[PDB]
Structures are given as structure tokens and as C-alpha cells.
Design a protein around this ligand. Structure first.
Ligand SMILES: Nc1ncnc2c1ncn2[C@@H]1O[C@H](COP(=O)(O)OP(=O)(O)O)[C@@H](O)[C@H]1O
Ligand SMILES: Nc1ncnc2c1ncn2[C@@H]1O[C@H](COP(=O)(O)OP(=O)(O)O)[C@@H](O)[C@H]1O
Ligand SMILES: Nc1ncnc2c1ncn2[C@@H]1O[C@H](COP(=O)(O)OP(=O)(O)O)[C@@H](O)[C@H]1O
Ligand SMILES: Nc1ncnc2c1ncn2[C@@H]1O[C@H](COP(=O)(O)OP(=O)(O)O)[C@@H](O)[C@H]1O
Lengths: 445, 67, 442, 435, 436
């Protein structure tokens, strides 16, 4: 697969009951009962879908579980619901305004759901017979398609003849034709003719011969966010702008016609509206203009639920020269509700370390787990989390499979935390370059 | 001009890039008697012609040349 | 049904020839600002003046944006209304002056009417009739083209020019398809195939539009509503051309460009020429800018220049600051973040804060819009909560209360649910007290 | 012959099977604990299981941080990707710095692909196409000095054959898997049809016509991202003239990254592809802005992020982009909490002497022992780097007087000609007009 | 080739040294500065040996003391075929390229690849061309009688040679060179036939010549990047060349070096006024100096204990101490009276100016009083004042008239400080009126 063991991959959903009551340890989350209950309330707000434009703020000290709670919300949200998780530094672009980047991030988080039916005729072409009239204005086509089980004869129109003359099939290629829409594709060449032409070439590919029933019926569901429609209706060939990001400040008229037409599509009954969540991690470093645009853009009907995370105290706001709580102005803090996380104790740190050791497939002893719990009490939690992973390798170099206290002590001595590094820098300040660019290179005076 | 001594492949590729027949046919037009020879005398339909006449018009007759 | 912080207000709620009443149209209180906004709405409906500016000022959570949206609802949907934020003018493609001029031209509308003489329907016959004396060296010299059309309850045979048969051949018009010919231009277009010719082939791509209703020939009067910015961006960009530059720019990124004053002058003079002919009506509208303290003094200076124009619409500005430095300047102290040059050019409407009964009534209306049922004692405790912390905090704590009421399998919010929502979700003041009384980078 | 530039005496970490460092081994003198920690990190990277692990090694200048990073890259081998970077390279004028950081993050994850090369090459002796205006197939006959071979070909390759202007008697090159057709030129058997011709004449190929070869392709994830994110479109195989409109870099969306990940995850399960994570090394991390420092926190939490190795030589220093954030090593405390710090200690006199002798050995110079003591004393007095960079002028001045060996007088003469920073500062201070 | 009127360092043809790298008192236009010239000769031997890479040398001293002259002497004594990239400090602050990318291009412009190849040519004198043509132009026949001063021959020509001779019309009496493989025909001119003008070639008609190409690494980097062609080498819009193609070129160059098909030549990158670089440039240079494909970087500066750009502290020579740890420093000194007189005499002989002895003593006195460059600038103005009164030798009063007409720095500062009420100060206050 293409996923390694991430920072928090043990979190699979939010560990709640049916009455929104959090279990002490379930679904990878340990502790934080009030924050998990509030996140369950916000999850029920998203799943209800009748409300729009609400702002919560997860405030706490570092290494407490704000982005862990956001990951739990994203995992318990389920599929086909848009969840757009960005950081604070992503909106500063050189060819897009901050307002336009925030508009695209807002409209990436609300989608529409469209159901459609497919009647597929997928098979290998045997023989195409083209009949031309004397006048030549109308043409007929005898198509011989086949599977491994049955084959039949189909009648074609002139538009079939034109569409098969383009991307021309050579009597032994695998195609698939739709009946309701007339979609035409060339999947490739069969493996029965793989030893025919002695050199394949540039623009060919080999597929298996399709088997089973030749006719198939399938209902498929598509979820398209409003940003995709905004990009597509802005150019001639717009999917290249969807995959390359060169959209470049899409205008407002196309946005309001897309809003009007999606309201008309909801009223007709073709499509339905799926609201989602926009998560902004480390929200404290946005400009004051972005905050102005945010608290004006939270008042629209086509607005998702915005989850913002920060860990600053009373700090200055970028773009101004004064300090504010959480690095956010009071106008934005008026239109918000705050979930506050609390620091852990010995038992919760021990349980989180046990879960992270189980997830990384690392076996520990009781004494090593107690020593790592004491280290995570004194130092932070992520230091012990990294200490587990390096102590596993130190264990495996000894031809031993379980991590002992000697390995934890060796990993503690080899790698330093913040406080010991600060002490060693401050005791030996002459050997480092200070703020004025002074350094004693030589060891002799 | 880029020159590589002792190879005809570079000369062929350079002459193909400088005088690409699709683009050079797109920036010009076929003569009318030639078009009559293609369509009537040779049976080639109209839609099978290469695309021609994509050069933008100058402002005047005086603006069409530097001489 | 989606509710988002608004849509409980349906206009200002004034009566005719008089003043605002106490509660009407989703508005509670704010009588004088509602009367002033109604006078401004009547001035806009008078459709005479140009470039008048209104700045409405007050504290946070007072109702400036609600008053602007009430003005937009009171005018109706045919009058243009351009909402804007002061942070939107800073673009990295074109200068902010051009963005302000584009948003100025977006707020003026043109209503045009026209008459179309059409012939549409399924083709019955298509015969290019030869001439009596064909010319030598040629083939099938055509004198006219006979086309027969069929629709719902009407068939009619036509007699056409020799020229249109070339367009029939280029548009690939066969027998049995549905065509559309306007009178003065010719220019037959193929709208589709009839549904009676759908099931003779198993596979096809062409769509099947059914037979059109009404007669084959009917003159229809259409009415189209555009803006001046649409005409500017349509005349500035080229039409469908055969040059490589036009097709190359159509497949590339639509980069915004500095529209010259010459194109705007030509657009205004041709619009005035067709207005004087009696065909076009000009509808000025509203350009609304929220949080105008974000503008710097260059945009303020260009606003001073552009408000004295001949065509500029009514501009409504909103701000909530007091004695503040203007952005882009280091030592200019000004009210509401607006320099005195612009302050001298507008009229200021002051908005006032609320009291406890008005907070309770606003919470009642926002509860009855969100389809919620609140107990009376819980309503009084929520009104006390809104008095102590904020109106918006009391308004935003309604849906967690409804969810917690639903989780206990009840349909009514009680005191215990609002206490649980108090304990779960914090406000700004208690979060600030938590930040101040902690020293772990909180 | 051989070029030495401040390195290449470093061959690795010089550890044994139990991970304990030798004193002088692999070109490394001293520095036991940092080498052991780097060996543990090398083993963790070779374990190929964890994503987003980070390491910061800090110490004074001229202590061995970049040498340890290069020793890690040499210990991993050339198969594992290794992306070196400086902190000033993240500031570009075409895209934002976060896009550059994400591109450098995805440049360190590689894929190994098993591929086959099949080649036909020889003289064209028969070129017969057959139809059923549209040709059906072409029979091409090839001849080399070991014999002939006939092939059938599709009209697609026939169009490229006709585009290459291939006639009877030309020596061609056909790749079976890709369909690429290359024309070499006419043969020497047809060199006497005219006295003067414009055609180049090549001899017949000596080997067989048909050749098969097993090859291994290494492709990073950024290559697969940039192969699909071309804004102008695809390019031809041969183009000496560029496209008329300049294609610049663009902010690649995450949807393209997800689809590339889907394609790679499908290809891995069939056994065609093998995934290899690598190392992103960023030297001089104190040049990073606070916005890049914030985006690094999000980028380290992804599922496919590689192992990042940082280095810094600062003390308690204000973070760039901020005013009053005093933090160790110029790194904000948010990122330091996700880091593991390895300390680097300075050297004493005997290790400086051993390093000078080791560098003199690899530069093929012969130094007298009394000159080596003077060079060690100079290295302890001013700098190790100043003693290392004065070896080549001493060699040149010894070669001037027809000597293959360094004397003390050459060291004194090279000290007289070239100054260090301290004596230059002393001349700077007691001067009148701008030195 | 290489048109040039007169430069400020045009009298310098190289470092004046013997076989033991000892400096002569006066040789190749360079006088004085013995230790600096010896150190630059040792640096030249470092460059000529080519076995070491990535060594940084700093040249620091007072202004107008032989720094750029030393760099020009090193560049002249290097000779041709060895890359030498001389840039200024303000040339990398671009609008389409980042600073590190411009520095990388300037680094990779100074390492060259030497490739020797052989080609065969037909250089001769056309005696007679006979062309037989058909009505429709189907089959063409051609006879070419062509000769040197040594042989004579007749060639049958195929159709493509007929087309290549009709295009670029070759007549009898011309001297042409034909390449058989590529079909390129060049008219060298006309022969000596009165009945331009070149000499008829000698020896064999079919010659085989070996040519040597020196291609910089930046050229192969531009060529291998498929997004732009070779015209970006001339137009300049290379535009942030990626590192993957740099890795491919770095592998393929070593692959060619191991197989013996090509050779490595290193060059010199000279950065004049290095103190104007930013701190991010120095941090890039600190890691870019340790590559195997890194040239020798010489930097020139004249600042002393100034502010480093991009920071707020002061550093020696305007450079941070980590960069100064990676460098060895050559220091220049101020000039005496005799060396100033010799330099002014050399500049007098360079500009074809005839000088009297007493005028030379006056120029030396006013050179040791004010500046070297001021007396080096007066010496050509005084020649025009001499030519105004119709005499060739510049006398004393001719120097005095130019001294009176044209001012120096100190007199201008004195007059400005005397009459500062008539000029614009820092605060923007001026007085234009004369009265009151
Ligand atoms: N309740 C929890 N249960 C399990 N793991 C947790 C919990 N809270 C925090 N963690 C772990 O702590 C680590 C760092 O915490 P993080 O979520 O980054 O806090 P913050 O976002 O405040 O920095 C994460 O890897 C996460 O797995
Ligand atoms: N007079 C009023 N009647 C009913 N609701 C009001 C009134 N004034 C304000 N509100 C409500 O208060 C909320 C916030 O007010 P807002 O218009 O944002 O004030 P401001 O624009 O000054 O911040 C809105 O959702 C609106 O519904
Ligand atoms: N333990 C060691 N053994 C041998 N050589 C060393 C050792 N440590 C450092 N060096 C040499 O000293 C120089 C220090 O350079 P570098 O490590 O890049 O400086 P910094 O540590 O400031 O980045 C390198 O050229 C390296 O070859
Ligand atoms: N040794 C020398 N020989 C000849 N000319 C010299 C010598 N030293 C300096 N000059 C002359 O003095 C002038 C100043 O030299 P230069 O090094 O360019 O100034 P700076 O030291 O400010 O860079 C030059 O025009 C040069 O011709």
C-alpha cells in the first residue's frame, strides 16, 4: 500500500456511545471527555445538514490533541462528505489573492450528489461492416462484438460511424459502449492478439478479454464540489486547471450563476446538497484581512462548518500592532464557540504510549513502559513517542525482540530533549553564533 | 542556427521544426485552382482539407510589411 | 431547508407613508436606522441621483449587515446589488483601482427588449431547385431551396434563398431533424432530432428534443437584463475569430486586464444612443462594502475621485471602529478608519445597542426560524446569558441545545440542556480568563 | 585525475555489527556518540516502516554535521533517494514556499520498476506495406552481419517510419516495447551510387539483429507528479527548439497527488513496483521563515512524508519573520517538540592533527612531522578549516623549489601570504580608509 | 575579433612572474604588490593543476588598490578555453529567477567539458558546374569539376547535391567547403581572379580535421531540460531549472569521464563587490562550495566592519564569520610615490599620450595628494587641451588648466560645505533666491 505509520494513524473515529457519551478508551482516543462530547455535538451538526456557517475553535496547549480530535472527526465523518484540511500558511500565494484562496477553500468543502444509470456493452470487436447508400447522406453499421460467453450483432448510426472512425478500432480491440448516452471508449487490445504485430508501439495497451454477461446495468453516485463546477465553467478545457491549479481568480458572475443553477437543480430533484467541514490548523498566523473576509463569508447559505485550531496564548495578530487572545481579533471571537482541551496526567500518558507502541508493532516490558511514562511526565509526550521507535531499533541490534530498560536508557542518552539542549547551549554559549553574529571558532585563547 | 558536424538526423529534425508543414499550412492558404483540383478532380471532400487561413489580418495594407 | 445567520429578515418592515413599527419583518428595535434606510431605499427607487454614499456605524453585533441585506431585499431581485469586503480589492493580477472600477460598473444594470421572428420545427422536405439556364463550367446551379417544416398542430412549406443551402450543408442538416431559422439573418441551426426517429438504431449519440409546441412561425418578445461590466468584458475580449491569437487565448488562463477609459466611454455613448431610442432602460443599483477600515488611503483617494462620476451608483459602507489610524498612514487619527475627505462626502447613520427584552425577542425569532421549541424559563435564562456575554453567543448556542435535547429523546429545550451547552462550549471572556490564569503556553 | 573538495575522505560511519563506533575508521576521527545515533537513524530508515520522523543535529561550526549527513547518505547507498537542500532554496519567485517544500518532500520517495528493452537494428532490405487508402500492415526486412530477420508492423509504427524518411538500404533502429523508430543513415554498400551525395554512410551492425536486455528504472514521486501536471501539454520526443510560450511552475493541487497515489498503490500490489522511502536533508535550517516552520508541522504528519534531517549552528536566536521569539538553534518550540536533537562536540589537539594528516593523505602530499606539529598548532590557534585549506598552497610552494615534500619554511611562507579572519580583522580595525 | 576601444585595465596582460612564481618589479603592465601577485600566482597554479575544487579566496583592501586589476591579470594569464565568469554582487537580484537559482547558474557556468571530435570536409575551388535539367524537374544530372592548388577532379552529383548547389548559388571561380554528412555548403569567397577575395586551398580535397569543443555545464542543463530550447541560452529565460536534470547531467558527465570520451576543465568564478549579497546568498554559498563540480571562487570587496545585508549586526568585510572561516584572504596595500608614477607612465603610454617630465612630476604629486584615479582621468583631458592649442607634448600648464576645470572629491565637499544654503539637504530645504 501507500500509507506508512503516520503520527496519529491509531485514531479510527471518535469513541462515543449512542447517547453522545465518550468511552474512557475506545476507537484510539484516550481521555478528553468534554472535548470529545463537544466534537460529537459538532459531528451531529454536520450530519444533520440543516445549518450553515458556524465557527468553532479548538484551543489548548501544545501536544494536547486538537489535531487528534480533528482527525477523529474526519474519520467518523464517513466517506463522500467533503473534509478540507488546510494549514495557515497555504493561503499566501503569488498568483492568487488571499480572499480568492479562502473562497476556493470554502467552496471545496460543500458538494452536490448526483445519481445516474449506466448500461454498458463491453467487449472485443470482431467485425465492423459499413453500409453506404447511393446518396451517401445516411450510413448503417453492422457491429460484431463478443465476450468469452456470448456474442451478438448490433445496428449503428452515422454518429457511431463517425465516432468509431475517430480513435479507430481494428477488429480485435476492446471497447465499451453506453446505450443511454452513447459513450465510446477504446480500452485497448485483447491478449488473444498480443502475438500478432511483433511490436506494440507507442499508443496501445493490452487488456484482458471481458467475460460474463455482455450487457451490464450499474447505478453510480458522483459527489462534485462547487469548486469543480467553478473551475470547469471558467475556461474551455478546465480539467487541466483542476489538476494544475492555474485557475487564477475566477470571477463572481460565474459563481452566482452556479449558485442559482444549483438551487434550481435542488428544486428540480436531480441533485442533492452535501455540506462538509473545513479544518484550518494553526489559524493564528493569518492576516487581519483574511479574518475580515472569514467573518463576512461565514454568513452565506453555501458555507461549510469551519473548525479552527490554535495554541497561542495572548499574542500579537499579524497585520496589526496589538495583542489578542489566541492570536485572533475579538470580532472573529464573537462569532465562535470554543472547545478547550486539558493537559494529561500519568495514566492517560501511559495509555496513549501503550496504544502508540501497539500501533507501531513494538513490544515493551512493564518497567520500560513505566520509565517512558515517567519521561513523558517530565518531558513532553512526543519525545517518549519517538523514544519508543528508536529504542525498538536499539533492541533489534542486540538480537533481542522486546524493549528493555537498558535500551530506553541508551535511547535517552543518545537523543536529547529541549531542556537539556537549552542547558548545553547556555553553558557553552561562546561556541555558537549568537544574535549579533559572534562566535569563538578556535579552541585556544 | 544550431549546427552539429557529421550528422544528418540533426539537420532533418531542425528542418522539421523550422518548417513544420501543419503549422506552415495553418498560417497560409491553398490556391483556388489547387483547391478545385483537390475537390472536384481528385474526389477529396472539403472536411478532409488541412486547416488553413489562421493568420491574423493586419490593420491596413501599409501595416502588412516592413518595407 | 438551510438557515445561516440571516434569512429571518424580510425587508425593513416599514408601513407606507410613515415610520417603522416595533416588530415586523424579522426586525426588533432599531427604529430610526430602519427609517433612514427606508428613505435611502426610496431615493434609490427614485432613480435620479448618482454617487451618493451612506456610512452606517455602530458597535459589533448591532445589525449593519442585516440592514444592508434588508435594503437589498426591499429593492427586489431586478435591481443589482453587489456585496463586497474591503479585503477583496487586493488582487495579485490587476491593481486595486481597476478592481474598484469593475465593482462600480457591476452595480448598474441595463434592461433591453427585442422581437424575434423565427421558423422552427422538423424538416419534411429539403429540395434545392435547379435553375432554368444553368451556367457552363459549374454544377447544380440553385435558384431557390424549398424546405417544409412541421411542428405541433402546424405545417408550412417555405421558399428560401440559394445561399442558406451552404449553411444547411455545413450544419449537417439531414431529413427528420429539428431546425431553427431566424428571419433577418438566415443562419439555420440544428437543435436536435425528433423523438419519432429515436428507436431505429440500437446505438446513437444524438439527443432527441421533442416536437416544439405552438405554430411554426411566431414572433416572440424577449427581455434581457445585463450589466455594464458584462458589456465591457464582452466588447474588450474578442469574438469568435479565425486568428491563432483568439483560439490560443481561449484555451489559456483568463488573466484580468486594465480596461481603458475609451472602451467605457464608447459603451456609455452607445448605451445612451439606444436609451434615447426608447428600447433600453437604465437601472442603477447598490454597491455594498463591509468593513471599510481594511481599505488604505489610495483606495480612499480613488473613491473620492470616482464618487464624482456621471454614472456611479449608490455606495453603502459599513464599519465598526472608533478613533483609529487609517491604514497606509502612521499618524492620521480618524473616526471609523475613514479619512475626513471621504467622511465629508457621505451621510452617517448611527446604530444603537439593544436591551434585555429585545435580546429575548431576537432569540425567540431565531429559535422559531430554526424549527426549535424552547421552554419559557430556558428562554429567560438564555436572555440572561446573552445579556452577560454576547447576543451572538446566545444565538449560536441554540443548535447544540437542540441536539442535546434530541439525544435525550425529547423535543423541547430545558434548563439542564442549556446548562450542559454552557459547560461544554465556552465564550470569549471565560476563554480569555483561562488564557490569563495559565502559564503553559495556553 | 582525481578531484577532492572538502569531503570524499568520508566513506561512511565506520561502525561494527553491534553498532559501536571505532575511533579512527571510515575517515571519521572521534565523534562516537553522534556516529552511533546516526547509525541508529540509518537502521530506522532501512526498516522502511515509519513516516515523518525527524532529526536535528546541532553544534558549533566546523564540527561535522554535514559530514555526518553525507556519511548517512553513503551508508544508505545509491538506491535509496537522498535530497540535499539549503534553507535559502525554498524562496522562489514563481510559486509559494509551501509548494516548494511539498515538492522537495515528494522528491524523496522513490519507486523501483522492472523493465525490458528489445531492440531491432539493421539494414532495410524489404519495405512492403499492404492495405485492408488505409494500410493494414507492413512487412519490414532487416539484415545485419550475422543474418536477416523479417517482421510485421502496425500502421502506427509505419507512420513514424515514413516520417523518418526511411527507404531501402538505410540502417534503422526499432524499439519493440515503445515503438520508437530512429534512422542512422545509409549503408556503405550504397556509397558508390554517386560520387557526391548528402547522405552519411554507416557500416553494417556486427552483432545480431534482435537484442534483449533487463533494466531497472528508478522514479521519484515528484517525477510522476510533474509528468501529469504539464499546463501547456505533452511534448514531443525530439525538440531542440522550445515552446513559444514559457511554461512556469504552478501550485499542484492535492487531487492530482491523490490520483498519483491511487495509481502507485494499484501498481504496487501487482509486484511491478517497489516502494523505497528516503531522506530529505536540509542544511542551515535557521534561514527558514516562520510560515515554512508552521507548514513543516502539517507536512510531517502526512502518511507518505520521508525522514527529514536538519542542521543548525546557532544559539538562542530570534526566529526569522518574528520579533521577540528567542528560541534555541533558531527553531521555534513547536517544531522542536517533534524533533530529536543530536549534539556535536568540538575537537582537541590530537584529533585536529589526525584530521590534518588524513586530509594530507587523500590529497597525495607528503608532510614532515615537524611541519605537521606546526599545522596542528595553527589549527588549534585559528581554525581547523584554515589549517585544512593551507595544505595545497604548501604543496604548490614545495613543488616550486623542486621538492615532493613539505618543509616548515613552506608553512611559514603560506602563512605569510594568506591570512585568516582574525588577522584580517586586526588589519581592519587599525586602518584609515576602508581597510 | 573582440573589439575594444580602451579599458581601465586594458594595459594589463597578465601576472608578471618568473618560473619560481617570483614577481618582477615591472612586467606585463603590473607593478607593485609583490605578495598579492605571488599569492594570485599560487592561486593560478591551483587552477591550472585542477586536482582540487571548491576553494574560496577573498581579496580585500582599500579602494583603488589593485583588486580588479589582479582579477583581470589572473583572467589574462589563464588564457582561452578555460571558463571565467566575472559577475557583480547586484546582478543576482532578479525578477524571474531566485537568488539561489541565479547563483547556481553562475556556479555552473564555470565548469567545462572538453570533447574532441573528427569531421571530414571538402574545401576547394570550383572550376566548372554542369547542370542538366528536365522539363518537369524530375531527374537532374550534375557534373562538378573542382580543384585545389595540388589536385583536380570531377564529381558526378546526385539530386540532393543538385538542390543544395542551386540553393546558395555557387558559380565558377568560387571557393567552397562542403560537408558530406550534413550537406552544409559555405561560400568562403572568390579566388584570385581579376578577369571577397581569398586564397585557393592547398593539399588534398578531402581533409579530416579534429575540432575541440568546450561546453559549459549550464548549457547541457538548459539543453537537457525539455521545457525550453537552446534559445534560452541567448534570450535568457531559462526559468528555474529543476534539480533532477542537474542530477542526470552530473551522473552522465562522470560516466563520460570514466569512459574517456570527455574531459573536465575547472574555471574561476569572480564576484566583484561581494558585500552587496544577501545573507541567504552566503548561506547558499556555504553549502555550494563543497561540491565536486564546484569551481574556484574569488571575491573582491573593500568594505571594513560594515553591516551585513539582511541582518542588523556588523561583520568584518560585510561577510559573516562562517563564510570567512571557509576562505583564505589576500590583502592589498596602498601605493607609494614611485609606483604611482610608474602606473601613470604606463597609462600615458597606453592612451598614446606624450608627456613632459615636469608634467609627470606634477601628476604624481597630485596623485599622492588626492587619488590615483583622478590623475589617471586628468591625463586624457590634458591631451585634448594640448591639442586645442596645436602642440603634441602635454606641458605643466596643460595639466594646471585641467586641474582648474575639473574638480575632485575633497574640493567639491569643501565648496558644498561652504555654500550649503544653495543645495538641497537631507530635510529638503533649499534657497533659490539670491537677495534676502
Ligand atoms: N486523546 C488522545 N488519544 C490518543 N492520542 C492522543 C490524544 N491526544 C493526543 N494524542 C497524541 O499526541 C500526539 C501529539 O498531539 P497533537 O494532537 O499534535 O496535539 P496538538 O495538536 O495540540 O499539538 C499525536 O500524535 C496524538 O496521537
Ligand atoms: N434588529 C434586529 N432584529 C433581529 N435580528 C437582528 C437585529 N439586529 C441584529 N440582528 C442579528 O444579529 C446578528 C449579527 O448582527 P450583524 O448584522 O452581524 O451586526 P454587525 O454587522 O454590526 O456585526 C445577525 O445574525 C442578525 O440576525
Ligand atoms: N570526525 C571527523 N573526521 C574527519 N574529518 C572531519 C570530522 N569532523 C569534521 N571533519 C571535516 O571538517 C570539516 C567541517 O565541515 P562541516 O562539517 O561542513 O562544518 P559544519 O559542521 O559547520 O557544517 C569538513 O570538511 C569535514 O571533512
Ligand atoms: N599593480 C598595478 N599595476 C597596474 N595598474 C594598477 C595596479 N594597481 C592598480 N592599478 C590601477 O589602479 C586602478 C584601480 O584598480 P582597481 O583594482 O580596479 O580598483 P579597486 O581596488 O577599487 O577595485 C585601475 O584602473 C588600475 O589600472
Amino acid at each position: 500500500s501507500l500509507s506508512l505509520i503516520a503520527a496519529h494513524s491509531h485514531i479510527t473515529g471518535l469513541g462515543l456511545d449512542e447517547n453522545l457519551q465518550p468511552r474512557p478508551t475506545s476507537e484510539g482516543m484516550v481521555g478528553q471527555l468534554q472535548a470529545r462530547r463537544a466534537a460529537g455535538v459538532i459531528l451531529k451538526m454536520v450530519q444533520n445538514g440543516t445549518i450553515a456557517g458556524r465557527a468553532v475553535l479548538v484551543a489548548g496547549p501544545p501536544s494536547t490533541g486538537k489535531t487528534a480530535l480533528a482527525m477523529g472527526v474526519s474519520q467518523s465523518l464517513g466517506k463522500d462528505v467533503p473534509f478540507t484540511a488546510i494549514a495557515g500558511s497555504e493561503i499566501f500565494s503569488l498568483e492568487l489573492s488571499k480572499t480568492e484562496a479562502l473562497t476556493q477553500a470554502f467552496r471545496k468543502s460543500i458538494g452536490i450528489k448526483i445519481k445516474e444509470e449506466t448500461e454498458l456493452i463491453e467487449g472485443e470487436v470482431v467485425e465492423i461492416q459499413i453500409d453506404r447508400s447511393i446518396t451517401g447522406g445516411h450510413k448503417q453499421g453492422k457491429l460484431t462484438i463478443k465476450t468469452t460467453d456470448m456474442e451478438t450483432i448490433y445496428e449503428l448510426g452515422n454518429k457511431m460511424i463517425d465516432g468509431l472512425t475517430k480513435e479507430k478500432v481494428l477488429a480485435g480491440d476492446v471497447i465499451s459502449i453506453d446505450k443511454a448516452s452513447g459513450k465510446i471508449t477504446k480500452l485497448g487490445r485483447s491478449f488473444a492478439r498480443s502475438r500478432d504485430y511483433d511490436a506494440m508501439g507507442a499508443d496501445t495497451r493490452f487488456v484482458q478479454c471481458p467475460e460474463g454477461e455482455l450487457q451490464k446495468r450499474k447505478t453510480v453516485v458522483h459527489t462534485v464540489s462547487l469548486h469543480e463546477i467553478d473551475v470547469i465553467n471558467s475556461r474551455t478545457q478546465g480539467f487541466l486547471a483542476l489538476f494544475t491549479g492555474d485557475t487564477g481568480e475566477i470571477r463572481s458572475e460565474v459563481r452566482d450563476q452556479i449558485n442559482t443553477k444549483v438551487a434550481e437543480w435542488k428544486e428540480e430533484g436531480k441533485a442533492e446538497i452535501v455540506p462538509g467541514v473545513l479544518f484550518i490548523d494553526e489559524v493564528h498566523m493569518l492576516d487581519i484581512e483574511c479574518f475580515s473576509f472569514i467573518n463576512r463569508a461565514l454568513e452565506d447559505e453555501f458555507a461549510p462548518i469551519v473548525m479552527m485550531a490554535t495554541n497561542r496564548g495572548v499574542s500579537k495578530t499579524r497585520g496589526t500592532n496589538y495583542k489578542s487572545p489566541h492570536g485572533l481579533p475579538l470580532d472573529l471571537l464573537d462569532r465562535s464557540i470554543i472547545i478547550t482541551t486539558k493537559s494529561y496526567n500519568e495514566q492517560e500518558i501511559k495509555t496513549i504510549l501503550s496504544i502508540r507502541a501497539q500501533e507501531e508493532e513494538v513490544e515493551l516490558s512493564s518497567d520500560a513502559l513505566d520509565l517512558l511514562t515517567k519521561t513523558g511526565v517530565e518531558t513532553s509526550l512526543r519525545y517518549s513517542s519517538n523514544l519508543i521507535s528508536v529504542a525498538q531499533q536499539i533492541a533489534m541490534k542486540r538480537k533481542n525482540n522486546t524493549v528493555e530498560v537498558e535500551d530506553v536508557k541508551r535511547a535517552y542518552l543518545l537523543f536529547l530533549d529541549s531542556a537539556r539542549s537549552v542547558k548545553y547551549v547556555q553553558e557553552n554559549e561562546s561556541q555558537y553564533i549568537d544574535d549579533q553574529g559572534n562566535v569563538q571558532i578556535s579552541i585556544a585563547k | 542556427t544550431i549546427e552539429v558536424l557529421g550528422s544528418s538526423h540533426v539537420t532533418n529534425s531542425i528542418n522539421n521544426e523550422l518548417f513544420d508543414p501543419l503549422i506552415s499550412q495553418a498560417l497560409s492558404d491553398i490556391p483556388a485552382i489547387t483547391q478545385y483540383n483537390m475537390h472536384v478532380k481528385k474526389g477529396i471532400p472539403v472536411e478532409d482539407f488541412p486547416k488553413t487561413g489562421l493568420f491574423p489580418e493586419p490593420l491596413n495594407k501599409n501595416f502588412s510589411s516592413n518595407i | 431547508t438551510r438557515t445561516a445567520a440571516h434569512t429571518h429578515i424580510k425587508g425593513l418592515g416599514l408601513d407606507e407613508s410613515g415610520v417603522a413599527k416595533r416588530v415586523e419583518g424579522g426586525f426588533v428595535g432599531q427604529i430610526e436606522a430602519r427609517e433612514a434606510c427606508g428613505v435611502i431605499v426610496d431615493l434609490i427607487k427614485a432613480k435620479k441621483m448618482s454617487g451618493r454614499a451612506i456610512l452606517l456605524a455602530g458597535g459589533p453585533s448591532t445589525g449593519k449587515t442585516a440592514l444592508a441585506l434588508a435594503i437589498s431585499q426591499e429593492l427586489g431581485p431586478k435591481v443589482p446589488f453587489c456585496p463586497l469586503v474591503g479585503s477583496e480589492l487586493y488582487s495579485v493580477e490587476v491593481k486595486k483601482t481597476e478592481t474598484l472600477m469593475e465593482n462600480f460598473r457591476r452595480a448598474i444594470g441595463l434592461r433591453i427588449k427585442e422581437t424575434k421572428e423565427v421558423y422552427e420545427g422538423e424538416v419534411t422536405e429539403l429540395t434545392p431547385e435547379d435553375a432554368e439556364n444553368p451556367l457552363g463550367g459549374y454544377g447544380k446551379t440553385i435558384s431557390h431551396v424549398i424546405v417544409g417544416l412541421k411542428s405541433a398542430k402546424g405545417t408550412k412549406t417555405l421558399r428560401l434563398d440559394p445561399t442558406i443551402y451552404e449553411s444547411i450543408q455545413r450544419e449537417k442538416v439531414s431529413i427528420g431533424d429539428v431546425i431553427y431559422i431566424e428571419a433577418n439573418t438566415g443562419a439555420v441551426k440544428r437543435v436536435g432530432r425528433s423523438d419519432a426517429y429515436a428507436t431505429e438504431f440500437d446505438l446513437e449519440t444524438e439527443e432527441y428534443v421533442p416536437l416544439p409546441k405552438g405554430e411554426v412561425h411566431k414572433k416572440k418578445e424577449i427581455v434581457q437584463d445585463v450589466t455594464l461590466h458584462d458589456l465591457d468584458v464582452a466588447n474588450a475580449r474578442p469574438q469568435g475569430g479565425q486568428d491563432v491569437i483568439s483560439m490560443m487565448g481561449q484555451l489559456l488562463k483568463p488573466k484580468k486586464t486594465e480596461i481603458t477609459e475609451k472602451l467605457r466611454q464608447e459603451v456609455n455613448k452607445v448605451v445612451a444612443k439606444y436609451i434615447d431610442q426608447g428600447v433600453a432602460e437604465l437601472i442603477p443599483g447598490v454597491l455594498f462594502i463591509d468593513e471599510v477600515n481594511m481599505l488604505d488611503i489610495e483606495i480612499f483617494t480613488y473613491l473620492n475621485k470616482a464618487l464624482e462620476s456621471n454614472i456611479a451608483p449608490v455606495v453603502v459602507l459599513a464599519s465598526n471602529r472608533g478613533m483609529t489610524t487609517v491604514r497606509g498612514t502612521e499618524d492620521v487619527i480618524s473616526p471609523h478608519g475613514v479619512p475626513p475627505d471621504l467622511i465629508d462626502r457621505l451621510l452617517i447613520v448611527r446604530t444603537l445597542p439593544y436591551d434585555k427584552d429585545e435580546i429575548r425577542t431576537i432569540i425567540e425569532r431565531r429559535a422559531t426560524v430554526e424549527r426549535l421549541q424552547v421552554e419559557s424559563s430556558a428562554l429567560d435564562l438564555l436572555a440572561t446569558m446573552g445579556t452577560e456575554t454576547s447576543l451572538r453567543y446566545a444565538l449560536q448556542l441554540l443548535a447544540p441545545c437542540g441536539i442535546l435535547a434530541q439525544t435525550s429523546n425529547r423535543k423541547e429545550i430545558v434548563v439542564n440542556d442549556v446548562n450542559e451547552a454552557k459547560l461544554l462550549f465556552l465564550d470569549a471572556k471565560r476563554s480569555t480568563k483561562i488564557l490569563e490564569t495559565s502559564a503553559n503556553y495556553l
